[PDB]
Amino acid sequence: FKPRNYQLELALPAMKGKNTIICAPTGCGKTFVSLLICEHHLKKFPQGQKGKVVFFANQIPVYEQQKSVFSKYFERHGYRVTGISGATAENVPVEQIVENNDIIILTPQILVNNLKKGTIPSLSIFTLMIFDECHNTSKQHPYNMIMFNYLDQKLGGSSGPLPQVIGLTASVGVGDAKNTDEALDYICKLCASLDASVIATVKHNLEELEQVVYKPQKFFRKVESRISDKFKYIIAQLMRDTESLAKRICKDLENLSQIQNREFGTQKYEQWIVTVQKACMVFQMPDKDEESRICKALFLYTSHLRKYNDALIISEHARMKDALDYLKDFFSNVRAAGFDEIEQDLTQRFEEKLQELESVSRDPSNENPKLEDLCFILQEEYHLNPETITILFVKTRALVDALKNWIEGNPKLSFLKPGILTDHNILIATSVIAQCNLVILYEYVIKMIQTRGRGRARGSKCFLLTSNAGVIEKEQINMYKEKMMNDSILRLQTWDEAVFREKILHIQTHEKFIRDSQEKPKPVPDKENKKLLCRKCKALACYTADVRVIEECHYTVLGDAFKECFVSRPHPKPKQFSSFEKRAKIFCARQNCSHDWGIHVKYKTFEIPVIKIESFVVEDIATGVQTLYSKWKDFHFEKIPFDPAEM
Amino acid sequence: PFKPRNYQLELALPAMKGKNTIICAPTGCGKTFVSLLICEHHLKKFPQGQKGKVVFFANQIPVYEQQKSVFSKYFERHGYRVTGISGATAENVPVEQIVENNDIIILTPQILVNNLKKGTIPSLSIFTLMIFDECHNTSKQHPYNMIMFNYLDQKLGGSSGPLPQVIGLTASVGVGDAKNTDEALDYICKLCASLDASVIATVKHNLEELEQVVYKPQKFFRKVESRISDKFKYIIAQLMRDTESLAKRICKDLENLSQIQNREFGTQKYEQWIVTVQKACMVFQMPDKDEESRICKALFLYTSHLRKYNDALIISEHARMKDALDYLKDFFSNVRAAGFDEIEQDLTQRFEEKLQELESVSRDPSNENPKLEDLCFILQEEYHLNPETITILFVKTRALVDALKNWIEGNPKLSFLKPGILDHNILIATSVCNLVILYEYVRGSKCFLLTSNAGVIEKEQINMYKEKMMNDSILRLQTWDEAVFREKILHIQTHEKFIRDSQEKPKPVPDKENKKLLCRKCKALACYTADVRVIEECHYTVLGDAFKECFVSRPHPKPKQFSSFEKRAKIFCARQNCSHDWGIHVKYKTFEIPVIKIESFVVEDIATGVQTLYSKWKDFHFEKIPFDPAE
Amino acid sequence: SRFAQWAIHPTFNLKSLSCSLEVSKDSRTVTVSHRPQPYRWSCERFSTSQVLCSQALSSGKHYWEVDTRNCSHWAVGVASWEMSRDQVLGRTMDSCCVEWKGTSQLSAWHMKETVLGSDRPGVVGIWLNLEEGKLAFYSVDNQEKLLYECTISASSPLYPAFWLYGLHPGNYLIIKQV
Amino acid sequence: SRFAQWAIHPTFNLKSLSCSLEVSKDSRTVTVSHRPQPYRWSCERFSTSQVLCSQALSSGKHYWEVDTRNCSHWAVGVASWEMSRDQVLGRTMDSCCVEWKGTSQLSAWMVKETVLGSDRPGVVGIWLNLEEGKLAFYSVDNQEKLLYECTISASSPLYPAFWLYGLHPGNYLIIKQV
RNA sequence: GGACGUACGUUUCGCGACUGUAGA
RNA sequence: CUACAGUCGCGAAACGUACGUCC
Ligand SMILES: [Zn+2]
Ligand SMILES: [Zn+2]
């Protein structure tokens, strides 16, 4: 509640009316500094000038926490705090909410949306912009879009009442740099894109820094992998079988993708499979129905080989039971939707091998040595002190539930209890609170931001498990990279304000020049009506003469027979994004197709099928060439904006 | 001569058995003594009726001459017919006589590739011992690998008679392109398979006896940061912004022409961008032909001046500023004496506006490159200890060697040095003694390494780690069994024979058409493809008389001669301000014809009208008509 | 070697040791691994940082001394053959032992944490008497101070199980003279 | 502290040391850095690895003592303020010194190169008697072995001036009490 | 649906400089 | 002059995968 020099020396240069990239590690202290500079800006106001500041936060929980704290404090001092979330984007006139408040906490995506609209034409309507976590102002961010507007309004030669752009972040980040010279160029570029004449950093309160920082130590763990693998042999036999039997209509598949000799159970094998998938997508037999039948059968073939590769990798990382259950769940999934003779042969073949899988996967000698030594070092930890709640970080969300079930039913380590949040002894989250001193990253190569309150550290362990030298090399380099980014800020601290001013004047003039050169408009749209076909059916479903565009991001189909050429099935997680409410997903309606075409939205009163280009092949009508645009932004055609007046 | 020690027998011994080694002897003429021992022991052991035949490949002409001299001077006593062949010998006493009439041949390997290509020598069965020097260069398409392609294609498959014992003679087997130890083992297996080799014997026992020959100097890294008062870069950025604005005003489509997103002044990326812009604006098609003259000439001139400014910036970031200023001033005197032009007068005026303030900025002790001050600190402080040391300072380009020699000759503090480029104190040499100072390059001697761009330090420390990886993988491979190792390299050789023996169809299709070539910056219509001639598959010339007006020459003061011609003078474009470097003027053997090269030209198609930018006549297709002397 | 010497020098069993250990042919000296050797999967592998002897005990007469230096954290105590594999020593009702803890305390786990001061022995001599249940740890040079006595009325032999912090490569334990 | 004790211990002039040496905040101990540290460049910098003191000398009485331990190759002597700044110490007519050269000699420079024997001092003691124009390097414990004698009757200050080999991070010299 | 950011890995493509070779 | 050759340095495009985040 009371500010120290640990937090007042931060506001000491900021109170002059300048812009800074102050980096504090505390969360409550960062919020205290933002409240401090907001209070200093509000209290300095003469009559004629009142508060019109804006506070940018990125994610929704930080936004709601800041709305709670800023409406809690600045209610007594005669100021009106309002905020904008997803649920506030509709049914209100936005400009009155800009004007009739002082401390608006809106998320930057909706400000970029309203810069597209026309509301707030110049940013003089605000006098302050307070950015949170401004190290994400790297390139093409909405933060960087706002800074593009402010920089071309200040530097452009149309100089008027420009606002201040004081920013705040937690740690600068190295980004895409390997060398300390590029670390300096990165940090100075981050000052340049934010109009930062100064970097404020803690120098005289290093003791108050060292009390609350929570900096624990490295704990890499080093392990050799298995020799006696049977599931790899049986699944390799099934993959030999399925790939060999698949080739009866397609011989040139090895000639059709340029990938070299693939290995069973690697990432490059999945690259091989998806490349031969995109290869066999483009077969163009003039039958157009045997084309459909043949392409559907080989679609079944390559999808099954892909899922078998996923089972291989899951066994390579996690327990054999996890791969077994995942393939069983996949066959239960394919058991629900449709059935074909290719599929019936593959299901009866899987049921043939399934009993041997369930036999050999239940041998306790087939435990993974990575898992064995992981259990070993964990029982070492629980022999050191049995009162440590453990939290883990794995590479992927798939091995989260795998290690949940590794806990669920473990007699050797029965003092762990599941707590998934992606009164809990164990929790596994995948990617980035600090009151439990145990984090275990298993097969995983800015570090983890585990500091929110004004707590303490008192020790921790951070167990990382290694099975290849890649994490060893890259993470020892990365510990040296933490050392040289500390060296990077210690090199930046040895300058003058004027030479930094002309340096950022060079860089800002350069970036203004390049941004003003890069002004390519949209190219000539294709007015040629092309057709679309399903990827797994090769069924003509729609054209480009019946596809609308809502807000230059979304693409709908006006076909009403197209409305009965899919099937609608309600969403497992219905929600909104800026115009809508999701109601359902839609699958392709054929004999046994069940391809995921898109999403079904509720806009005002309709139920509109927003489709995706990812489940589509774009075919010519004049010649008939079936090309494959993967993102909607690269399918250049005559885009027709949306018409609600029709229906 | 010298004397045989113990390790120089230990290295030689695995080849004395009669198996194809790869010797990993370190430098210090131990390898050229070991080759002597192995050649002596091999030739001395044959029975009567037959006799041996050695061939020692060397790669560089001085290394060839040195090994020819020592293999004559060591085996003249025994009565061995030493010889040698290179590119410098004359066409007489042919190779069929020489390899039949000698005992120890020293080739440079392109000669044997030539003879095996044109079928004059049958195959390698006439030889009995091929000694490859610097065998760790056996790679993608190197001449050692071409001879190895022929030797493996004889061995595998249609098995012929006796084949020669390959012996390598590297000094480090080069684990490059590898990251982890398995890939380093893959590299040494790939190389040792590609030489038909089985034993990679190094010294193991008398290692302490070795180190009186080789010596590893201890290193120091001295990273120094850049400048801050970069007024030179500011003024040059001003000039570049101005001329780039002029070029953008006369083009209005410039940022469509290359996909390079972010281009700053004074790197290598800007030079890639300006080259791509030049190659885009050199091809144009718009049916206003005298508009094309102004457009192409203006774009070539602006791009050429921008490229010169970019090179001036690159030179100024690694030397003193006065070197870049002298470079620009020599360039501007070379462009002002060339022609008269509105654009050239505009650029000369815009430079010589800023000229006097630029040279006032350059002639300054404060605006000094701190890298050169750190070098002067090192050279001062080291030579104050041992004033007899000599220094082999390495630099990157050539212009930096000339600039640093000018800098050492022109300094107050550095009076006691006597430089010499490549009796002398230091040697300012790029890519050939107690001080081996590296200037940004990737008893009791030291090896410093100055840099500004961090990452040079990282590449040198990664290279030291790679040497340790090389030693570890050599030691791991030295413990295998020979039979499984022979089978492993037999599978690698078979896989490589299958890959190489499968994709050799770059079949050309002759575009039997007629095209007209244009000048590269003025777009004058030069000649026709129907009137060019291929003389001896090397040179190309225009047998026309209407062409004889379209170029005006310039007399080259000394004459010259080829192997079969006599070059007289250069020739140039006869237009108003083009003066382009087309080619040279030569005589065949009787009369005079102009000979041109495809680098400074475009190929304008007659029918379609499109123009393309070629660089090799091997790349460009047409009716290559052999020249007839009767015309 | 001046009071009552009663037992023989113990010797580690070659089938109830850990997965990690590479105990020498001298068979009174164990040294830890730098990466463990994966052995054959059996139900008699203890799967801990443990190793057991094979000397079946006697009527009442036992005393043995082992070198406990050059180890960060060790654990010496007695255990029966039919003890559960996944359970570590110090977690059962069949154990009396000595524990030089991680927090610089000489504790023990017995039937319960019996903490002493911060005394670290270098060599420990365990004295076992099965006639009346008298047990003594005559460790080193502290006027043969046992400092605690435990009483075990068991029905099985009580083989010394040797535990150590199994994550320090280079650690070694020795059995030496009584 | 047994012969005629006359003079004071000096302090390095921080306007005159070059960019490499980084004399600590106690300000009587000269030490080399790991990498240079860019300070405000003046004309009075050295661009060498040298250092000057601050105190102008006297009529007939000066002496100080310097510890030449912890150094590869060092040189200690005197110099006048009007010294050519880019020039090495001891190679003008403005200086006498003693230098520990590359071939391990106690050489001394009145520019005149005289090699001495292979005795490496730990401690160097400079005695000045400008009343008679005398300068002598009694090292330590040698029953006052003079190790050189040079004559300079200058009209300038003769500050204690030091050179040390500035490429060995960890090289440092100490002034200590008489 | 789409936007953005980060990381891993693969397959090519041109550019500039340095070094050397054979034919003519 | 043709013409291969090996190394270095900086790049640009077409990708798959993994995580998160918002609108
Ligand atoms: Zn369909
Ligand atoms: Zn021309």
Residue numbers in the entry:
A (entry chain A): 241 to 662, 690 to 699, 706 to 718, 722 to 923
B (entry chain C): 240 to 661, 690 to 699, 709 to 718, 734 to 922
C (entry chain B): 252 to 362, 364 to 430
D (entry chain D): 252 to 360, 362 to 430
Sentences from the paper on this structure:
Riplet is a homodimer composed of an N-terminal RING domain (catalytic domain), CC domain (coiled-coil domain, homodimerization), and C-terminal PrySpry domain (RIG-I recognition domain). Each structure contains two RIG-I molecules, one p3dsRNA24, and one Riplet homodimer, but they differ in the relative positions of two PrySpry domains, which depend on the relative positions of their partner RIG-I molecules.
In the structure containing 23.4% particles, one RIG-I forms a typical end-bound complex with the terminal triphosphate, but the second RIG-I binds to the opposite dsRNA terminus in a “semi-closed” end-bound state, where the CTD has tilted away from its normal orientation while maintaining engagement with the terminal dsRNA diphosphate. As the second RIG-I in each structure recognizes different types of RNA sites, the two PrySpry domains bind to RIG-I from different approach angles, revealing variable distances between them, ranging from 58 Å to 101 Å. This finding suggests that the CC domains in these complexes are more dynamic than expected (consistent with our inability to visualize them), enabling the complex to accommodate different spacings between sites of PrySpry domains, and enabling PrySpry domains to approach RIG-I Hel2 from different angles. Despite the different relative orientations of PrySpry in the three structures, the PrySpry domain uses the same interface with RIG-I Hel2 in each case. Unfortunately, only the structure of the PrySpry domain of Riplet but not the RING or CC domain could be resolved.
